[PDB]
Amino acid sequence: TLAELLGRSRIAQVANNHKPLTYTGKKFHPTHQIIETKPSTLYRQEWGLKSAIPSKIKSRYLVYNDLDTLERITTFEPRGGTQWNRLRFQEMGVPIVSNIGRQNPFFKYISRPEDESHAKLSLFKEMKGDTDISPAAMKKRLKKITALIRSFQDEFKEWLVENHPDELKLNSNKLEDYVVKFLNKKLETKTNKKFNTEIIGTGGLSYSLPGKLKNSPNGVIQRTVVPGRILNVVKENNDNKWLAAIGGFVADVVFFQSPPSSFNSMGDFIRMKTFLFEILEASMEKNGSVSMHARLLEPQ
Amino acid sequence: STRYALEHLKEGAPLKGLFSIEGLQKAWFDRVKYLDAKLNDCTNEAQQKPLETLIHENSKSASKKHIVNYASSLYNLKFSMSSLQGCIRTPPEECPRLGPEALLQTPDFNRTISNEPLTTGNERLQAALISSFGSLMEFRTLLINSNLAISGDGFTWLVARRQLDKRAMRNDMPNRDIEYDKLFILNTYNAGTPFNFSTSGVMNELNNQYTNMEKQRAKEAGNLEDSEMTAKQAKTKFIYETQQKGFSGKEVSYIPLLAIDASPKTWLTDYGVFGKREYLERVWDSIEWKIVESRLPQRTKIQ
Amino acid sequence: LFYKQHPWELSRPKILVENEIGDENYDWSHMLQIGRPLDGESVIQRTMYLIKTKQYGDMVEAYDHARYEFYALRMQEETEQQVALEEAEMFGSLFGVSAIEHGIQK
Amino acid sequence: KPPVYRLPPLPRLKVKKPIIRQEANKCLVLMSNLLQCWSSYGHMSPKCAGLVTELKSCTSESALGKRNNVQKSNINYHAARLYDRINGKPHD
Amino acid sequence: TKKIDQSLSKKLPKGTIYDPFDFSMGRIHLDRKYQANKNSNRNDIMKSGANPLEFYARPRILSRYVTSTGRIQHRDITGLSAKNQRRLSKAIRRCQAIGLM
Amino acid sequence: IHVVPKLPNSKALLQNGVPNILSSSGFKTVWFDYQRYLCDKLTLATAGQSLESYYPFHILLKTAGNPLQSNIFNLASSIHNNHLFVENILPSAVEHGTNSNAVVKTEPSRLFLSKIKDSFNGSDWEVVKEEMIYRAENEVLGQGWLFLVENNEKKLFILTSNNNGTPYYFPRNQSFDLNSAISIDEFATLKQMKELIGKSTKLNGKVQDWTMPIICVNLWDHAYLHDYGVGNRSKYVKNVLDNLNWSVVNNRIFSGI
């Protein structure tokens, strides 16, 4: 049918997005899907959207929100520059590593309940992970849940007197433990936030596995040298490290011992010059940012 | 040439599960005969010195390259077949040949594992692999994918960086000098060697000859240097050096532990044009981890 | 969900211009298909095939199964490109401007 | 939530007095600095030598220097061209 | 001179991605134009769901919605809903009558 | 989708291979299997991108200057090179399937033999063939390609590539193997090439090269192993150069009419 075809169409494949096309806050990862048109289609203003893109647009990449609007225009920005940030990261050949030594999210590992010993930490995270929830929809998590949990009273009024009667007659320190486990055991079958929207690992920035060496005609590369730019002429206030702009990413640069004298000389125009850096490590934070650490390699 | 013979490779017998009889002939016997002849037709010391000696003696010289190309091709090929024992998988000559559909199959190297080192007693090798690669599924994926990527001739090596970048009294204590900091995977192409101590700096050395020769011809012409040839050559030299330095010093060597051959000569006869990944899967299930654990140096516990 | 979990997949350019919807002969028993790129849509269609064939019951389980197949294919491509560049430089390939250099000039 | 205010149908969309930016003359600012330099270090002081040299070059041919002394706004041309398309008026 | 006004230079945060356009003056001007107090909601008690009339005895919180002379700010400035603006103004007027604000 | 081109007289090729060079099994490996392998990989690499609508020759030129598209470049170069090799070694370019023609006597043209003498200091075609066989054995340790190319100066010269090296674009000829040792003369050639690529003003850092191939010989294991075996690649190159289709090779030399 036409409905089945539409669901699989290339326009349907792009997930709905109404995020501001002009965002002036902190950008940590791509927010809009880049759309690309071939040169032949660009010559005919064809982008696979509802309407022809204005001929003024010479780029072959754009990002859009709405196919059409009440203003009879498409809401789009003729830019595709997050792809070059990803490709420049690939050229630096620095694998993303976990600073906490967690399991690789891209491998199906056999995990155990080692961290499941915090059942009361996360079972209540469902009601306590409400940092940005409505004052009454969050309050609907109190009566709606109370009835659901209160429907298991008979089950827990028999299991507890049949599996741990001593605790019911001695102390509740262990009873509370049996309660946290009971709900989770009766909730694993349930589907509360069965889909987790948190970023998985690198988020797609890099699928490179650590360990491989870079062979070169001049031997194996031991230190990665990448051109960059120093943004500030004074270390980040309250931090012992300056900031550099390397390959579309802002990194924290650690200097060997001293800061080169071009800093004082250049001053606030230090960003006008290019220095050579060494990328020590690259980490991923939960906000979806990349924590790139560099080192200002100076001619010596 | 018994000097290039292995006890598990017998003419007329197939390495069960990886090579057939016709595939082991072409892959190893018919191939060592050619390489040996070429090495005996370039240097008269072939039957006198060890292969690894020729590789590290006639290196960095453009006039002896053919002695080192054939010498290092026969070394890599022996080091590759040495760690292979076979598998219980159906013989390659009795299985149907993979066709174009193979290119569309999803590799399952991130969900399952098989023939792990620890399962055979090599517990020190499994711990090292987990420490350097994170896990044995990551290592297997990074090892099979790196070889599959190689288009033509080459080898995927499991190496161990030597923590003796001091260069003082180097190669004088077969234990104090045999210490490995971390394990790595390295790809070599055609007749490239996995050591890196006998071939590093080569381009930097040749680059400095070229600049000096050009600088001396400029002096004959009578020129006032240049605005950015002294700043460009300097940068090219400063990068060439900073990219070959070690943690402490600039003597970074590697100890071969394993080697998988990527050359089509090895796998084209038995597995066909579409069966390189099938070959690499059966190679992983045919590695005797005892031989690899044996080659493993002792950990450098400076920590 | 997929693009919320993998924000950088958005940075991979997508072509919305169709070729011929009627020619698509896809067997979603496998993720790779001749004629279309490997992308988020490959995962979604694989998930639907799993739930349609009843191999998995919960959509989440089918989705996770498809995601891992996607990671494996993405890792094999990241290595084929890195190795291809390395192998070419080792045989004397020369390149004018790298991506990092292009950004510096701009 | 930010309140959108929608206009009624209008006979025109026009800015009465479009704001055009007018860049400053480089000779006038050069003169303004030299005059200040003389106010601190003194008139003819050797510290203002460069200012004097620059001012002379700026004003050598034209006292206000050669400048792109023209700039007009096009907002009213575009506003009148696009108003019917973007006003969101219902169909006839 | 080795110094530039802060209004003429953009400081790129750490961990963020950037484009070449982020070093231009257009970025500076664009950031000024689209500079709104959107982070107030997370720091705005009255935009959280609390009833502003419960703060009639807490002049410190109420003093965040009046000018230097005590004039209640228009809803255009506070950004509150009609109900919260209505309740907040009542709280302030009651606070003034009690002798606290 | 990139599909394997149909070859003239394909039924004969699938039964009796290429007479005097490859057998039926040998030709199935080099073309019917390897060309399918390359095209499928190219389709997977380029599907969904702008490169999907371009022929392999244009893809390699478009991607020749992009370091991270080398994988696509390699596939496009191999696909173009393989059909250049299979085309000049083919019994007949015209489809005599219904004409059952068994008399195809093609010989070097006068323009080809005139440019050979001019460019090789009077050497004959037979001597040049010996130089080509020698160059392949000493310059291509592993996989690669042997080309007889013509440059902008009307001079025919011999170019060898390692793995998938294009003859059209000198920065990607891959004629020097840097895994082994290089002489100061080879480093000078590489250094001079790097300087030429740096003189270009284009933001894509691309240069102009008008070299064009005339003869192509596949030196990959997919073409000779099954029929000749390890070490007998010089016997394979000799047979290829002796049984070339000169109706195709002559047409590749620009005449100007």
UniProtKB/Swiss-Prot annotation, chain A:
A Pfam entry, by short name: Mit_ribos_Mrp51
Gene Ontology biological process: mitochondrial translation; mitochondrial translational initiation
Coiled coil: none
Outcome of swapping residue 240 to H: Suppresses defects in the 5'UTLs of COX2 and COX3 mitochondrial mRNAs
One MF term in the entry's GO annotations: structural constituent of ribosome
Record keywords, A-Z: Mitochondrion, Phosphoprotein, Ribonucleoprotein, Ribosomal protein
Keyword Nucleotide-binding: no
UniProt key word Nucleus: no
Effect of residue 260 to R: Suppresses defects in the 5'UTLs of COX2 and COX3 mitochondrial mRNAs
Reported effect, residue 259 to L: Suppresses defects in the 5'UTLs of COX2 and COX3 mitochondrial mRNAs
Gene Ontology terms: cellular component: mitochondrial inner membrane; mitochondrial small ribosomal subunit; mitochondrion
Compartments where found: Mitochondrion
Family: Belongs to the bacterial ribosomal protein bS1 family.
Quaternary structure and interacting proteins, as annotated: Component of the mitochondrial small ribosomal subunit (mt-SSU). Mature yeast 74S mitochondrial ribosomes consist of a small (37S) and a large (54S) subunit. The 37S small subunit contains a 15S ribosomal RNA (15S mt-rRNA) and 34 different proteins. The 54S large subunit contains a 21S rRNA (21S mt-rRNA) and 46 different proteins.
Leftover remarks: Present with 656 molecules/cell in log phase SD medium.
Protein's name according to its UniProt entry: Small ribosomal subunit protein bS1m
Species per Swiss-Prot/TrEMBL record: Saccharomyces cerevisiae (strain ATCC 204508 / S288c)
Gene for this chain: MRP51
UniProtKB/Swiss-Prot annotation, chain B:
Subcellular location: Mitochondrion
Regions annotated as coiled coil: none
Principal location: mitochondrion
Keyword Cell membrane: no
InterPro entries: SOD_C_sf
SUPFAM superfamilies linked to this entry: Fe,Mn superoxide dismutase (SOD), C-terminal domain (SSF54719)
Keywords: Mitochondrion, Ribonucleoprotein, Ribosomal protein, Transit peptide
Claim: Ribosomal protein is one of the keywords in the record: yes
GO cellular component terms attached to this protein's record: cytoplasm; mitochondrial inner membrane; mitochondrial small ribosomal subunit; mitochondrion
Gene Ontology terms describing biological process: mitochondrial translation
GO molecular function terms listed in the Swiss-Prot or TrEMBL record: structural constituent of ribosome
Family, as annotated: Belongs to the mitochondrion-specific ribosomal protein mS43 family.
Function: Component of the mitochondrial ribosome (mitoribosome), a dedicated translation machinery responsible for the synthesis of mitochondrial genome-encoded proteins, including at least some of the essential transmembrane subunits of the mitochondrial respiratory chain. The mitoribosomes are attached to the mitochondrial inner membrane and translation products are cotranslationally integrated into the membrane.
Additional comment: Present with 2840 molecules/cell in log phase SD medium.
Name of the featured protein: Small ribosomal subunit protein mS43
From Swiss-Prot, chain E:
Subcellular location: Mitochondrion
Molecular function via GO: small ribosomal subunit rRNA binding; structural constituent of ribosome
GO cellular component: mitochondrial inner membrane; mitochondrial small ribosomal subunit; mitochondrion
Coiled-coil ranges (or none): none
Keyword line: Mitochondrion, Ribonucleoprotein, Ribosomal protein, Transit peptide
Protein biosynthesis keyword on record: no
Main location: mitochondrion
Gene Ontology biological process terms, A to Z: mitochondrial translation; translation
Something else known: Present with 1210 molecules/cell in log phase SD medium.
Subunit-level organization: Component of the mitochondrial small ribosomal subunit (mt-SSU). Mature yeast 74S mitochondrial ribosomes consist of a small (37S) and a large (54S) subunit. The 37S small subunit contains a 15S ribosomal RNA (15S mt-rRNA) and 34 different proteins. The 54S large subunit contains a 21S rRNA (21S mt-rRNA) and 46 different proteins.
Stated family: Belongs to the bacterial ribosomal protein bS18 family.
Function: Component of the mitochondrial ribosome (mitoribosome), a dedicated translation machinery responsible for the synthesis of mitochondrial genome-encoded proteins, including at least some of the essential transmembrane subunits of the mitochondrial respiratory chain. The mitoribosomes are attached to the mitochondrial inner membrane and translation products are cotranslationally integrated into the membrane.
Name of the protein in its database record: Small ribosomal subunit protein bS18m
Lineage of producing organism: Eukaryota, Fungi, Dikarya, Ascomycota, Saccharomycotina
Gene assigned in the entry: RSM18
Swiss-Prot record, chain F:
Highest classification ranks of the organism: Eukaryota, Fungi, Dikarya, Ascomycota, Saccharomycotina
InterPro entries (alphabetical): Mn/Fe_SOD_C, Mn/Fe_SOD_N_sf, SOD_C_sf
Family the UniProt entry places it in: Belongs to the mitochondrion-specific ribosomal protein mS42 family.
Name by which UniProt lists this protein: Small ribosomal subunit protein mS42
Description of how the protein assembles with itself and partners: Component of the mitochondrial small ribosomal subunit (mt-SSU). Mature yeast 74S mitochondrial ribosomes consist of a small (37S) and a large (54S) subunit. The 37S small subunit contains a 15S ribosomal RNA (15S mt-rRNA) and 34 different proteins. The 54S large subunit contains a 21S rRNA (21S mt-rRNA) and 46 different proteins. mS42 forms a heterodimer with mS43, building a large protuberance adjacent to the mRNA channel exit in the mt-SSU body.
Tree of life domain: Eukaryota
Coiled coil stretches, renumbered: none
Chief localization: mitochondrion
One Pfam family, short name: Sod_Fe_C
PANTHER family: 37S RIBOSOMAL PROTEIN S26, MITOCHONDRIAL (PTHR43595), SMALL RIBOSOMAL SUBUNIT PROTEIN MS42 (PTHR43595:SF2)
Location in or out of the cell: Mitochondrion
Keyword Iron set for record: no
Record GO terms (molecular function): metal ion binding; structural constituent of ribosome; superoxide dismutase activity
GO biological process, one term: mitochondrial translation
Keyword Hydrolase: no
More about this protein: Present with 2060 molecules/cell in log phase SD medium.
Gene Ontology, cellular component aspect: cytoplasm; mitochondrial inner membrane; mitochondrial small ribosomal subunit; mitochondrion
Keywords tagged on the record: Mitochondrion, Ribonucleoprotein, Ribosomal protein
Source species of the chain: Saccharomyces cerevisiae (strain ATCC 204508 / S288c) (Baker's yeast)
Signal peptide: none
